[PDB]
Amino acid sequence: DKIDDAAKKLSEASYPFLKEIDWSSDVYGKLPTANPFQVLKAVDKMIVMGAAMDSAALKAGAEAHHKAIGSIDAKGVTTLADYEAVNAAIGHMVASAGESKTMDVYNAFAGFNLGKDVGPYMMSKVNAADASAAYKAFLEFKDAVKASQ
Amino acid sequence: DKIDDAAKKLSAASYPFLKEIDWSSDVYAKLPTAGPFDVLKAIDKMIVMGAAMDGAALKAGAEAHHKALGSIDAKGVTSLADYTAINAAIGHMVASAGESKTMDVYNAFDSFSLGKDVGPYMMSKVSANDASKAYKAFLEFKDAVKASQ
Numbered sequence: 001d002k003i004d005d006a007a008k009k010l011s012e013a014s015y016p017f018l019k020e021i022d023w024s025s026d027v028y029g030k031l032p033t034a035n036p037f038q039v040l041k042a043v044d045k046m047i048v049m050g051a052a053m054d055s056a057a058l059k060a061g062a063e064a065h066h067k068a069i070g071s072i073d074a075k076g077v078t079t080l081a082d083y084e085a086v087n088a089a090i091g092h093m094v095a096s097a098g099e100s101k102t103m104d105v106y107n108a109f110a111g112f113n114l115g116k117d118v119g120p121y122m123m124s125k126v127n128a129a130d131a132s133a134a135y136k137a138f139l140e141f142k143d144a145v146k147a148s149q
Numbered sequence: 150d151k152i153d154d155a156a157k158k159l160s161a162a163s164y165p166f167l168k169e170i171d172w173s174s175d176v177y178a179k180l181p182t183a184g185p186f187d188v189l190k191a192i193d194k195m196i197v198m199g200a201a202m203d204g205a206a207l208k209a210g211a212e213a214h215h216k217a218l219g220s221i222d223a224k225g226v227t228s229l230a231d232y233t234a235i236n237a238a239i240g241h242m243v244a245s246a247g248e249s250k251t252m253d254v255y256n257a258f259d260s261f262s263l264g265k266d267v268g269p270y271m272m273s274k275v276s277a278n279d280a281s282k283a284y285k286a287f288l289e290f291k292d293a294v295k296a297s298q
């Protein structure tokens with residue numbers, strides 16, 4: 001469908017970024033700029049969003065990540081093909097959850113002002129142009145998701 | 150049902166342990182005794198198990214956690230009523246996933262030999278009596294879950 005088509009485009013444009021991330025780093029376990037109770041507010045919104053998702057879409061998303069784990073290289077990076085299946089599944093998951101519950105997650109993360117520190121720190125460890133191209137691609141992808149909603 | 154009743158008992162018996170854990174600690178973000186790709190391999194088993202759960206059971210589990218998040222005290226401990234609903238929902242989730250996929254998660258974590266370091270460390274920060282009461286209650290609870298499969 002159109003989400004599937006958009007997933008192909010998103011995946012191919014954002015794969016360079018995905019390959020550059022250090023998947024072995026322990027940094028992702030903690031958000032140092034927030035206390036745990038602040039992080040839990042965003043976790044709450046993601047739990048609410050997930051509970052709003054179609055079971056069929058969630059199960060497809062789970063299977064796609066299971067396969068993706070199976071195809072990782074020595075650096076932890078799954079294949080483009082399995083990345084595309086992940087993005088297609090997540091697109092269908094987000095579609096089923098609806099806009100308000102998805103925006104509630106953004107809004108909860110906005111309370112961390114990640115653009116000041118975490119965002120630029122993460123970008124500094126990858127190719128900036130590749131990160132920008134992934135974001136441009138995400139902005140197009142989200143339009144197909146919203147069209148489905 | 151039988152899982153509901155077993156959850157009421159398990160929750161009351163394990164609430165002392167639950168209250169004693171330091172929910173504000175960052176220690177849970179990392180497992181120091183395994184590489185991240187070894188942890189990912191155990192996460193694979195949990196993804197598979199979650200994909201096997203009935204969709205409505207999983208949904209009920211998420212709604213129970215959302216409610217629990219709204220009742221946490223200053224130390225992060227949810228109310229016993231909400232903990233009980235969590236355990237009843239998780240019990241139905243596990244029952245729907247089945248025994249083999251649940252044991253596959255156990256066996257993955259058994260690879261980490263947690264009883265040699267992590268288990269003792271976690272138990273040292275709480276009351277060992279209450280941790281053991283929680284574990285014995287868990288062994289009774291799992292009998293009702295298995296009986297439902």
Ligand SMILES: CC/C=C\C/C=C\C/C=C\C/C=C\CCCCC(=O)OC[C@H](CO[C@@H]1O[C@H](CO[C@H]2O[C@H](CO)[C@H](O)[C@H](O)[C@H]2O)[C@H](O)[C@H](O)[C@H]1O)OC(=O)CCCC/C=C\C/C=C\C/C=C\C/C=C\CC
Nearest residue numbers: 031039042043105106107109110113114115118119120132
């Ligand atoms: C499985 C789910 C797990 C976690 C969910 C996490 C993240 C996804 C959820 C939400 C999105 C995240 C943040 C958005 C919120 C606020 C905006 C912001 O921040 O904005 C900052 C920045 C983006 O900046 C934006 O950047 C763009 C740049 O694009 C512009 O400029 C471009 C040029 O580059 C182009 O011209 C383009 O056309 C134009 O629009 C604009 O300037 C926007 O105005 C500006 O806001 O985002 C950033 O920093 C991105 C930082 C993301 C870091 C990742 C994770 C955070 C840490 C922990 C997660 C928490 C818990 C763990 C989970 C579970 C526990 C076990």
Ligand SMILES: CC/C=C\C/C=C\C/C=C\C/C=C\CCCCC(=O)OC[C@H](CO[C@@H]1O[C@H](CO[C@H]2O[C@H](CO)[C@H](O)[C@H](O)[C@H]2O)[C@H](O)[C@H](O)[C@H]1O)OC(=O)CCCC/C=C\C/C=C\C/C=C\C/C=C\CC
Nearest residue numbers: 180188254255258259262263264267268269281282284285
């Ligand atoms: C949402 C899900 C998230 C994470 C999943 C985590 C946990 C759930 C999954 C599996 C269960 C975990 C471990 C079990 C595996 C092997 C057994 C073991 O290890 O055994 C050791 C010990 C218990 O030992 C057992 O203890 C009992 C004690 O029983 C005796 O003593 C009792 C006294 O209470 C009774 O009298 C009883 O009758 C008597 O037999 C026996 O001695 C057994 O022989 C002995 O094996 O357990 C321990 O230490 C257990 C330590 C638990 C530590 C917690 C987490 C693990 C670490 C990281 C999480 C990873 C990733 C997070 C995910 C995502 C990131 C975003």
Ligand code: CLA
Nearest residue numbers: 014018021058061062065090093131132134135138192196
């Ligand atoms: C198996 C392990 C595993 C791992 C390591 C991850 C890791 C991640 N997941 Mg996935 N997830 C998994 C399993 C996993 N997930 C499973 C089993 C499910 C259920 C089926 C999901 C469902 C899920 C959802 C629904 C979402 C995630 C998202 C994310 C990312 C959140 C942080 C972020 O935005 O970074 C940066 C993101 C990436 C590196 C991913 C690829 C690039 C994207 C598409 C564009 C990035 C644009 C820009 C550069 C950064 C974002 C800024 C902007 C949003 C403000 C992170 C890379 C979230 C995400 O990516 O939000 C954007 C998200 O929405 N995951």
Ligand code: CLA
Nearest residue numbers: 043047163167207209210211214239242280281283284287
């Ligand atoms: C909102 C945030 C949040 C937080 C912080 C947690 C945190 C936890 N979850 Mg929950 N989870 C959540 C949301 C959350 N979850 C959501 C939204 C879902 C989906 C609906 C789940 C679904 C889920 C499942 C399916 C399971 C967990 C489990 C766990 C625990 C894993 C580590 C462990 O065993 O510690 C120790 C455990 C506790 C402190 C829990 C209470 C006491 C238990 C019942 C007995 C403990 C016995 C013994 C002392 C220790 C374990 C020994 C082992 C051999 C069994 C941990 C306490 C796992 C777990 O507890 O396995 C044992 C588990 O099986 N969670």
Ligand SMILES: CC(=O)O[C@H]1CC(C)(C)C(=C=C/C(C)=C/C=C/C=C/C=C(C)/C=C2C=C(/C=C/[C@@]34O[C@]3(C)C[C@@H](O)CC4(C)C)C(=O)O/2)[C@](C)(O)C1
Nearest residue numbers: 027028029030031032033117118119121122192193195196
């Ligand atoms: C049981 C089970 O399996 O659950 C499964 C549940 C899911 C949801 C399916 C699942 C998943 C997805 C998950 C969790 C995604 C998580 C994404 C987290 C991203 C975190 C990021 C980017 C964190 C940081 C931290 C940073 C810190 C930077 C700094 O501190 C540094 C260094 C130095 C300081 O001086 C300055 C600083 C700038 C402050 C940073 O820059 O970024 C998974 C894994 O499958 C597990």
Ligand SMILES: CC(=O)O[C@H]1CC(C)(C)C(=C=C/C(C)=C/C=C/C=C/C=C(C)/C=C2C=C(/C=C/[C@@]34O[C@]3(C)C[C@@H](O)CC4(C)C)C(=O)O/2)[C@](C)(O)C1
Nearest residue numbers: 043046047049050051058102103105106207208210211212
């Ligand atoms: C039942 C149960 O337990 O379910 C489990 C199910 C899972 C899946 C395993 C699970 C999980 C993970 C989940 C849900 C993750 C969710 C992630 C959500 C990410 C949301 C994002 C990125 C949203 C946005 C919104 C944006 C908006 C941007 C703009 O609008 C802004 C501001 C202004 C406009 O002018 C321009 C704009 C640019 C348009 C944006 O940029 O990004 C969990 C938690 O474990 C629960």
Ligand SMILES: CC(=O)O[C@H]1CC(C)(C)C(=C=C/C(C)=C/C=C/C=C/C=C(C)/C=C2C=C(/C=C/[C@@]34O[C@]3(C)C[C@@H](O)CC4(C)C)C(=O)O/2)[C@](C)(O)C1
Nearest residue numbers: 023065068069072076077078090094099102141142145146
């Ligand atoms: C440790 C380790 O090795 O881990 C390995 C684990 C794996 C899994 C094997 C692996 C991998 C692959 C990974 C992580 C892929 C991640 C993909 C993430 C995709 C996320 C997507 C698409 C999210 C969204 C959010 C959306 C929101 C859209 C909206 O809100 C927006 C904006 C604005 C609203 O107005 C309308 C809206 C429509 C509501 C959307 O449309 O899409 C890897 C790389 O190998 C690493």
Ligand SMILES: CC(=O)O[C@H]1CC(C)(C)C(=C=C/C(C)=C/C=C/C=C/C=C(C)/C=C2C=C(/C=C/[C@@]34O[C@]3(C)C[C@@H](O)CC4(C)C)C(=O)O/2)[C@](C)(O)C1
Nearest residue numbers: 026028029119120122123131132135178179180185188189
């Ligand atoms: C108990 C235990 O051990 O659990 C283990 C479990 C695991 C799964 C094995 C595990 C793990 C792995 C995990 C979660 C990995 C998650 C990775 C997430 C990476 C996120 C990245 C890169 C985020 C960003 C955001 C960026 C933003 C860039 C921009 O916004 C910037 C700045 C400015 C804009 O103008 C342009 C822009 C381009 C938009 C960027 O460039 O990058 C871990 C940690 O080992 C713990």
Ligand SMILES: CC(=O)O[C@H]1CC(C)(C)C(=C=C/C(C)=C/C=C/C=C/C=C(C)/C=C2C=C(/C=C/[C@@]34O[C@]3(C)C[C@@H](O)CC4(C)C)C(=O)O/2)[C@](C)(O)C1
Nearest residue numbers: 042043046047176177178179180181182266267268270271
């Ligand atoms: C996007 C999103 O929201 O995803 C949601 C996805 C879910 C699944 C729904 C979700 C959830 C649940 C999760 C992840 C549960 C995770 C549990 C993790 C438990 C980890 C433990 C016990 C870790 C450790 C580490 C230890 C270290 C011990 C030692 O090093 C110490 C200190 C010092 C030395 O002495 C040596 C040592 C002894 C070795 C230890 O002793 O224990 C959540 C939160 O809702 C988020």
Ligand SMILES: CC(=O)O[C@H]1CC(C)(C)C(=C=C/C(C)=C/C=C/C=C/C=C(C)/C=C2C=C(/C=C/[C@@]34O[C@]3(C)C[C@@H](O)CC4(C)C)C(=O)O/2)[C@](C)(O)C1
Nearest residue numbers: 058059062192195196198199200201207251252254255288
């Ligand atoms: C589709 C989708 O969205 O899925 C998502 C859904 C979620 C839920 C959000 C999600 C998640 C988290 C998941 C699945 C967590 C799973 C946890 C599993 C825990 C399992 C446990 C404790 C199992 C066991 C087994 C044991 C056995 C013990 C014994 O047998 C032993 C050895 C020997 C006998 O002589 C005695 C015995 C005492 C009998 C034990 O002691 O413990 C994920 C990953 O995000 C995917």
Ligand SMILES: CC(=O)O[C@H]1CC(C)(C)C(=C=C/C(C)=C/C=C/C=C/C=C(C)/C=C2C=C(/C=C/[C@@]34O[C@]3(C)C[C@@H](O)CC4(C)C)C(=O)O/2)[C@](C)(O)C1
Nearest residue numbers: 172217218221225226227235239243248251290291294295
């Ligand atoms: C950071 C922070 O503040 O977080 C806050 C977040 C919250 C959510 C609000 C909060 C809370 C509450 C929490 C964490 C509750 C956690 C509960 C976990 C319960 C887990 C259960 C029941 C797991 C299982 C596994 C089972 C497996 C059973 C079997 O395998 C067994 C053995 C043997 C096989 O032969 C048969 C089998 C039958 C297959 C089972 O039967 O059950 C708190 C405390 O407030 C903290």
Ligand SMILES: CC(=O)O[C@H]1CC(C)(C)C(=C=C/C(C)=C/C=C/C=C/C=C(C)/C=C2C=C(/C=C/[C@@]34O[C@]3(C)C[C@@H](O)CC4(C)C)C(=O)O/2)[C@](C)(O)C1
Nearest residue numbers: 029030031036039040175177178268269271272280281284
């Ligand atoms: C990006 C970011 O910031 O994400 C943040 C997201 C969150 C959600 C806010 C977050 C968090 C909170 C999390 C996951 C909390 C998880 C807590 C887990 C606690 C586990 C405990 C206590 C485990 C145990 C196991 C024990 C074992 C005991 C025994 O086996 C022992 C030894 C010996 C046997 O004979 C008897 C026994 C009795 C059986 C014990 O006694 O205790 C965090 C970390 O802030 C990160």
Ligand SMILES: [Cl-]
Nearest residue numbers: 048215216219
């Ligand atoms: Cl509400």
Ligand SMILES: [K+]
Nearest residue numbers: 008011012084
């Ligand atoms: K592709």
Ligand SMILES: [K+]
Nearest residue numbers: 273274275276
């Ligand atoms: K003690």
